[PDB]
């Protein structure tokens, strides 16, 4: 897998964001995770966390997996990195997302994310409190 450049257009919520990629505005949905919706418990905090992580970054990158790159809603499916740190893994590690939506052929970072989830759960963080 390869990291590709993108720039932030706008924060949306815990697991979606508007980025510019190859010079086109796209909504990205983060692979392998599920954040609560904004109206649900920990939704606000998931949104804030994702927002902060990407607004503070100097360099956003997106990494596509081996499978489909866009979902049925036209959202880009990627791992997102903020100054080299994966946003998908960070949300899970903080108990602000669950590992989810693990489809065959787009699951390269499954086990990395599951390890983060086990550690968030041990610590009783947020969703696991």
Applying CB under 5 A, the residues found at the interface with Ca ion are 15, 34-35
DSSP 127: G
> Three-class SS of residue 64?
coil
Contact flag: residue 34 with ligand THP (CB under 6 A): yes
Kindly state the tokens that stand for 116.
Answer: 């983060």
37 noted as active-site residue: yes
Annotated binding-site residue? 15: yes
The residue with its CB nearest to ligand THP is 101
Contact flag: residue 96 with ligand THP (CB under 6 A): no
Which residue among 12, 27, 101, 107 contacts ligand THP (CB under 6 A)? 101
Annotated binding-site residue? 70: no
**Interatomic CA distance for residues 55 and 50, integer angstroms:** 9
Which residue among 9, 11, 70, 71 contacts ligand THP (CB under 6 A)? 71
Smallest distance, Ca ion to C-beta of residue 38, A: 9
114 noted as active-site residue: no
Nearer to Ca ion, 34 or 65 (CB): 34
**Interatomic CA distance for residues 87 and 104, integer angstroms:** 21
Contact flag: residue 29 with ligand THP (CB under 6 A): yes
Torsion of Cα atoms, 40 then 99 then 95 then 20, to 10°: -80
Cβ atoms < 10 Å from Cβ of 115? 14
**Interatomic CA distance for residues 123 and 65, integer angstroms:** 29
Binding residues: 15, 34-35
What amino acid positions are annotated as catalytic residues? 29, 37, 75
């Amino acid at each position: 897998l390869h990291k590709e450049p993108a720039t932030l257009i706008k924060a949306i919520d815990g697991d979606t964001v508007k980025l510019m990629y190859k010079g086109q505005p796209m909504t990205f949905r983060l692979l392998l995770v599920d954040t609560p919706e904004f109206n649900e418990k920990y939704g606000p905090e998931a949104s804030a966390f994702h927002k902060k992580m990407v607004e503070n970054a100097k360099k956003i990158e997106v990494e596509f997996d081996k499978g489909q790159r866009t979902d049925k809603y036209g959202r880009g499916l990627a791992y997102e990195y903020a100054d080299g740190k994966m946003v998908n893994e960070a949300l899970v590690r903080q108990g602000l997302a669950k590992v989810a939506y693990v489809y065959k052929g787009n699951n390269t970072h499954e086990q990395l994310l599951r390890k983060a989830e086990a550690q968030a759960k041990k610590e009783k963080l947020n969703i696991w409190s």
